[PDB]
Structure 1
Amino acid sequence: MKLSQDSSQIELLKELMDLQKDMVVMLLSMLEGNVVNGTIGKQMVDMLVESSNNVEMILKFFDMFLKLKDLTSSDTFKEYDPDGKGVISKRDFHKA
């Protein structure tokens, strides 16, 4: 949330997202031999409920940025201003 409010840190944001992807694939590799009542699943749901707030925030972030690929270029925004490269006055974007 902090690195996205301003520019000149897109590299830091990209490196942070890469580290997060590596962390999530690491903690996902812990469940490749899972059982329906294994201890690793209990430990993982425990560490999830102990940090429900932060994971809820990142889920809201991912949902907000995934509900944008389709909400723009499906109905109206793709034909609002058809000039060429994406040009928007930032006021029609708000209402769109």
Structure 2
Amino acid sequence: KAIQVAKQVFNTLTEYIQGPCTGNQQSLAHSRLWDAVVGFLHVFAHMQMKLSQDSSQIELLKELMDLQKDMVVMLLSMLEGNVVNGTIGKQMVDMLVESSNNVEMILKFFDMFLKLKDLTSSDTFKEYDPDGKGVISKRDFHKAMESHKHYTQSETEFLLSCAETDENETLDYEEFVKRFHEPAKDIGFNVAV
């Protein structure tokens, strides 16, 4: 419910400053919006890191990335009509440097799940050819990932912990459908923009 209310508020702010209004843009520039945005990215990064595990918080994660997309759309709507070395750009870069750790966290999360290093490596298919679908022998996943992905627990073992799925040894492409691939592509596209 809180995510839905925040989404509606962000949509209202966008429709306030979707068109070039200048006065409204300056009004929200000289306000407390930047602190709220910084806190929002902080809770986004930490909640994404905490909820990357488990298997019951998928819908909350979906609404979470949806609110992320809405805020990034709003932020892009701020930069409409900017020039080189604009004041809005200065406020923007101040906002980034005020929350550098959260930005690094969300970027690291986006790089691991989708945005290369996932659904691109195609583990054991182009590297081992398991004579079938992407069932994977569980231990084959750790036997894989000898690539550009880091060996840290937050990079290699992170995927293993997040992709527990079945009990004994079986995985599937449904893991790639649920985590990474379809999410974090459209959501991260606005961040890249």
Confirm or deny: 8 A CA contact 2:111 2:117 kept in the other structure: no
- Give the C-alpha shift of residue 33 in structure 1: 0.9
Cα separation, 1, equivalents of 2:134 and 2:124: 14
Spell out structure 1 runs of 4+ moving beyond 6 A.
none
Spell out the pairing of 1:1-20 with structure 2 (5 A cutoff): 1-20=49-68
CA distance, structure 2, for counterparts of residue 75 and residue 7 of structure 1: 22
- The two structures have a TM-score, normalised by structure 2, of 0.44
Could you say which structure has the greater relative contact order, defined with CA pairs below 8 angstroms and 6 or more residues apart?
A: 2
Query: If each structure's helix is expressed as a fraction of its own residues, which one has the higher value?
Result: 1
Mark the CA change 1:84 to 1:74 in structure 2 (over 3 Å): closer, same or farther.
closer
Instruction: Return closer, same or farther for 1:78/1:9 CA change in 2, 3 Å cut-off.
Output: farther
Q: TM-score when scaled to structure 1?
A: 0.83
Aligned pairs, how many? 96
For residue 73 of structure 1, report the CA deviation from its aligned partner.
4.7
- Tell me how far apart the structure 2 counterparts of residues 58 and 66 of structure 1 sit (CA, whole Å): 12
Seq. identity, %: 100
- Which segments of 5 or more consecutive residues in structure 2 lack a partner in the other structure? 1-48, 145-193
Q: CA RMSD in A?
A: 2.4
> Contact conserved, 1:81 with 1:88, CA < 8 A, in 2?
no
Call closer, same or farther: CA 1:37–1:16 in 2, change over 3 Å: same
What secondary structure, in the 3-state scheme, does the structure 2 residue paired with 1:70 have?
Answer: coil
Does structure 1 retain, via aligned residues, the 8 Å contact 2:123–2:141? no
